[PDB]
Ligand binder design. Structure first.
Ligand code: MG
Ligand code: MG
Ligand code: MG
Ligand code: MG
Ligand code: MG
Ligand code: MG
Ligand code: MG
Ligand code: MG
Ligand code: MG
Ligand code: MG
Ligand code: MG
Ligand code: MG
Ligand code: MG
Ligand code: MG
Ligand code: MG
Ligand code: MG
Ligand code: MG
Ligand code: MG
Ligand code: MG
Ligand code: MG
Ligand code: MG
Ligand code: MG
Ligand code: MG
Ligand code: MG
Ligand code: MG
Ligand code: MG
Ligand code: MG
Ligand code: MG
Ligand code: MG
Ligand code: MG
Ligand code: MG
Lengths: 168, 176, 159
RNA sequence: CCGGGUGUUACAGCCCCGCCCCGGCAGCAGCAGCUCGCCGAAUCCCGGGGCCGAGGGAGCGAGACCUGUGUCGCCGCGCU
RNA sequence: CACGGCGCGUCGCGGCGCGCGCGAGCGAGCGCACGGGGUCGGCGGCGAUGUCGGCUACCCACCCGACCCGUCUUGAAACACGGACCAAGGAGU
RNA sequence: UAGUAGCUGGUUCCCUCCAAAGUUUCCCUCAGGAUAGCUGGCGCUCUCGCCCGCAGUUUUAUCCGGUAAAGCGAAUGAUUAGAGGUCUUGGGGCCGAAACGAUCUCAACCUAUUCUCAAACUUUAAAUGGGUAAGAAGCCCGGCUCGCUGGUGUGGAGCCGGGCGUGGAAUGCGAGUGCCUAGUGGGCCACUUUUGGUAAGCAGAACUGGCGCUGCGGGAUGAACCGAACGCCGGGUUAAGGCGCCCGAUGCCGACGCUCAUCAGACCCCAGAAAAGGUGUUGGUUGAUAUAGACAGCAGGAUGGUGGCCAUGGAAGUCGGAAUCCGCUAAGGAGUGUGUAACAACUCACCUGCCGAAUCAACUAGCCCUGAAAAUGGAUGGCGCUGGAGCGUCGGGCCCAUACCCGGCCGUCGCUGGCAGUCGGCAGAGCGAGAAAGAGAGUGG
RNA sequence: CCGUGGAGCAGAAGGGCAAAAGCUCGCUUGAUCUUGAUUUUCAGUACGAAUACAGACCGUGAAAGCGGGGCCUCACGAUC
RNA sequence: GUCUACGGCCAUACCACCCUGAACGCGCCCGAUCUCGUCUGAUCUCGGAAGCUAAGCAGGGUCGGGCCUGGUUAGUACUUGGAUGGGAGACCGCCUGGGAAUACCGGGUGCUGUAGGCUU
């Protein structure tokens, strides 16, 4: 048997509101930059990220994004955080200035670095503003319960791509 | 488990991570009936945690793949050994069904359990599924379909599509 | 309400461990504490002189004053919504060097040594402790023996 | 024609099993437009319906030997 | 095939890479557009004592919504208290 | 004298921004104050367009604990039951003048076991959790001062000078600091933990979130439940919940079953029910016997010792006490029941004839039914619904919130953003462009 | 002879204690004079209690040392 | 191989019984004038060297007790977080993570620092 390498990149979408959140879950959501329902972001995986996501399992749906999902998310919803301002990325020079020192100079560099989790994935992801996704067309199964028991919360390995296709 | 839609049968094999104590732990294989591979892996971890001293954090899914039906065109009799939880006590049972696919038979089993004993998928623990010869079948509801010259009519056909001609001057016929 | 005694609710905290009563081993007395060591507090009921208050039991502080028999240490205490770094005097029995700092010190010496080395070699070496990375791809070899089936066992009552 | 019994290819068929180039031939997640999947840097094309159109002196080339014009920047092209 | 000059070519490993000169880092026009937020260099009717426009405001009808305010209170539509209506005066100087 | 009032009542225009507390300590303090806490306003010191710090978070190290659990063949304290020993004593007896000389015993005692326990027990001992560290204020050198400590320029501390930048876990984020200060100091509710109480919409705590201070979609109705928090609008999509009609949405040729109620059932909080039962029906478990011919059902037998022994006035089998044998047999119990005072008589167990293939139990779990009685007429929200519009497991599609996405508009905040360059026949119209800096001025070959 | 404390340590209880903190003797008055710092309730205020020091006079012991009240947790009181 | 003096960790070192100890040493042992202290030269203190491993002490043994360390019990008990899960309740099941303790069955029975000896 050939066990493939554990995925290094995950996509996380907040699927619960602001009302009535435990302080610890609130702090982890703030750290992950999910301050609004149907916000999304990329997270690189390690022990710290695993435990951090486990703490906030009931509030997020996360999975392993596909290359097409990364492409579509960057091109359609991708805005850059330039000068503490949310600027839509309509030209390569905006990327080139904010990430020139890291040899990211266009959309292709940004997408490649995000998808392969490069040496400066932290800088690229932080430059990337959190994605504001629309409500899932076709509806959710059940927001409250876990994905394994027929809900939407928790970890879904590759079904996050199906979710993204309708949420963006 | 949420028995959503029609179930699928998955072969899942897993093992503990290598440790200084033992280089190569034995691989354990199980048949899981599940809507998809994610819940299949979850059920595998649950069952193997009950059986052996194994946990997902101290293990790994070596392989997980759907196993397709060998003969999906031959109607077969399936015997299922099952273990379920009632409102007071747990019971082992054996039920036979009649279908073309093992996954279809197991889905029938789940629906029948829900219908007859109000047992839920998180309560049912499926144990064994075997093709059973018609001579070895012992439930009359399955045995009564074992004859060469099967013959029966459709006595009282209830009119469907009752609303497409919502106002019709006939009184419908139920004998065809 | 409760009582404001200094030793209320310490019958287990200040007690001695099982089969460990009697003479205090002298190694505790024969340790050297200087100015600035990170040190742990653990009240020992065998000696009653210089016993720390129960709220500092299990806390870690920094030594700022060394005296004939006792040591003054600065330790943080959470009082309502604020933390006070207050200094207390504890006799040497109820104190113990913290091993949380020596690991970092040894790491500092070791990565400083490996930074000094390879400086002439020009190669690259990692110093920051990266978190546990995800497991990489590998092959699991079956040795001709197929994995054995696992099935749930039937219910049957024990009691 | 039906019912009961015997039985093992007969005036029907069924299952498994060594090979004959995994026997050979199409074809293949099949518009035999529903027998069962996951997808798209391994994905492109066309079409239909609905809502909106906020902003308003972006310049080009002309060269101190001229003073025009209001279709201009980035990008993708075509012709000489 | 986002390949396209001549050379001196080691700026070189055996040519490709890849450097030094070539009035010395200046070829020009037209045209089309999935290109830093809509335009038409597109049209059709009805207009003098019966017709055009008038969000709101006057009256009426309909569908949906809709418990009386102020106050103390954990909690007010309250089977808690003040209040028939109107004018003027009326309280952190 | 407009006496005082910690107590009632009232306390007059708009928009914009921020936004609480019912908790700590003290008070003849408990309907009130003072003080911390929570708020606002005014600022100030720096910061980025290599690096500093900080965190209701994790990771890697390292300590801290005595709850949940567990234990009593471990300490303390409770606690049941039998085993084996002895004279270590006592108690009923016995042979003995007496004798640990002897017989049983009952006991206390000892040794191994055994049943059940602890908020104020414990050898063990979690999960969740509480500290500390993760570098420049650090490491590595050289040298001075000391009245301290000193076998010893020993130890320690403080001083100077010098060298090391891969800024030494992840993630996120500008930070620090100072004045002045209102209101508040009656709280309540919910999951989980928990004390008193038979219990309570009772009384009292811990953590978190809410209501109060808050509107919106759903739960018919509703301070707290589920979803979601709000500027004025257009389009699209959802959450929770729903889609017979009221009432937007299944007017799907939806899938598989279960259930008949002369009191059916119908969705968290939540608004009504238990023990015990059913040969109603549907599943399941276990054990039997049946072509050496069962289960019914219809018929024949159902005997002797002996009216067995003790018994009672009478007990022949049938009120009572043990046992329960034999030969005859295809079989008959010293008897399963009805009957008389006793019999008698009938009947059963058991075996035969006809009939010729499946039949018996004992449990267990679903729905339904009995258990099930209150007062104005009455409430799955109503109508009503039984090839469901009920119950369980499920599939597509559809409906809509002030939530989410796109667009317009208002305002606030931030960029402590840009513009004095309107530099014009005396001029030459730029400083948006990935790369810290001159469309630089002139002199020689 | 056995005896891990099953005794005692003034008192309630808990902790602690075996060539001792218990019992018996010997000598004494650190229960003395004095300035500061710190902990406990805490507002981080007092009182009370306590902890390390420092400066003198001493006690005890061969000495190292120990001692400025009771083995620790309680036994107490502003202004005028 | 091992002992003595002073120790560190304080049972893997303790407890019960049995066997063996070459040399040095440690001891037992012989006396009370002096030092010193008792009812008692038993203890303590002092002065010695006839005898002995008897005892202490050291090493070893015990299907030894205990102790230490593993397996089993056990992914059981318990438990962070979640659900418009079940149930009239009592309570229980599931999802996401952590994860014990008896009985029972194995293994082991002091390591070591400084100074000084013996094994010529
Ligand atoms: Mg909520
Ligand atoms: Mg739609
Ligand atoms: Mg919830
Ligand atoms: Mg209305
Ligand atoms: Mg009032
Ligand atoms: Mg109020
Ligand atoms: Mg009244
Ligand atoms: Mg009143
Ligand atoms: Mg009135
Ligand atoms: Mg007026
Ligand atoms: Mg007045
Ligand atoms: Mg009052
Ligand atoms: Mg009042
Ligand atoms: Mg406690
Ligand atoms: Mg307990
Ligand atoms: Mg209450
Ligand atoms: Mg609020
Ligand atoms: Mg609200
Ligand atoms: Mg209701
Ligand atoms: Mg809308
Ligand atoms: Mg409705
Ligand atoms: Mg917008
Ligand atoms: Mg003494
Ligand atoms: Mg002194
Ligand atoms: Mg004393
Ligand atoms: Mg003598
Ligand atoms: Mg000896
Ligand atoms: Mg001997
Ligand atoms: Mg042993
Ligand atoms: Mg030694
Ligand atoms: Mg020799």
């Amino acid at each position: 048997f050939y066990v493939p390498a554990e995925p290094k990149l995950a996509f996380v979408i907040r699927i619960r509101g602001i009302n009535g959140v435990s302080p610890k879950v609130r702090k982890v959501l703030q750290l992950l930059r999910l301050r609004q329902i149907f916000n999304g972001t990329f997270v690189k995986l390690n022990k710290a990220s695993i435990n951090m996501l486990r703490i906030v399992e009931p509030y997020i749906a996360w999975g392993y994004p596909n290359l097409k999902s990364v492409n579509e998310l960057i091109y359609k919803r991708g805005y850059g955080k330039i000068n503490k301002k949310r600027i839509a990325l309509t030209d390569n020079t905006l990327i080139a200035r904010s990430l020139g020192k890291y040899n990211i100079i266009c959309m292709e560099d940004l997408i490649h670095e995000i998808y392969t989790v490069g040496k400066h994935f932290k800088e690229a992801n932080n430059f990337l503003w959190p994605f504001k996704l629309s409500s899932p067309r076709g509806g959710m199964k059940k927001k409250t319960t876990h994905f394994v028991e027929g809900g939407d919360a928790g970890n879904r390995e590759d079904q996050i791509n199906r979710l993204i296709r309708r949420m963006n | 488990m949420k028995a959503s839609g029609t179930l699928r049968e998955y072969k899942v094999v897993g093992r503990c991570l290598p440790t200084p104590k033992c280089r190569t732990p034995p691989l354990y294989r199980m048949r899981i009936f599940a809507p998809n591979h994610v819940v299949a892996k979850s059920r595998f971890w649950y069952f193997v945690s009950q059986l052996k001293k194994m946990k997902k954090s101290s293990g790994e899914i070596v392989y997980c793949g759907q196993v397709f039906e060998k003969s999906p065109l031959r109607v077969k009799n399936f015997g299922i050994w099952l273990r379920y939880d009632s409102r007071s006590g747990t019971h082992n049972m054996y039920r036979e069904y009649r279908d073309l696919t093992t996954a279809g038979a197991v889905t029938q089993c789940y629906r029948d359990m829900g219908a007859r004993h109000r047992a839920r998928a998180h309560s049912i623990q499926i144990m064994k599924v075997e093709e059973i010869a018609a001579s070895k079948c012992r439930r009359p509801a399955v045995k009564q379909f074992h004859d060469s010259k099967i013959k029966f009519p459709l006595p009282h056909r209830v009119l469907r599509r009752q609303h497409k001609p919502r106002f019709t001057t006939k009184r419908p016929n139920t004998f065809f | 309400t409760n009582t404001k005694g200094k030793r209320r609710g310490t019958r287990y905290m200040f007690s001695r461990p099982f089969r460990k009563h009697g003479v205090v081993p002298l190694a505790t007395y024969m340790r050297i504490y200087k100015k600035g060591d990170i040190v742990d507090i653990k009240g020992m009921g065998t000696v009653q002189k210089g016993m720390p208050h129960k709220c500092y039991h299990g806390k870690t502080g920094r030594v700022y004053n060394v005296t004939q028999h006792a040591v003054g240490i600065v330790v943080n205490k959470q009082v309502k919504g604020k933390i006070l770094a207050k200094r207390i005097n504890v006799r040497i029995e109820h104190i113990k060097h913290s091993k949380s700092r020596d690991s970092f010190l040894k790491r500092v010496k070791e990565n400083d040594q490996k930074k000094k080395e390879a400086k002439e070699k020009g190669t690259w070496v990692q110093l920051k402790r990266q978190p546990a990375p995800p497991r990489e791809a590998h092959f699991v070899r079956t040795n001709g023996k197929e994995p054995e089936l696992l099935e749930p066992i039937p219910y049957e009552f024990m009691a």
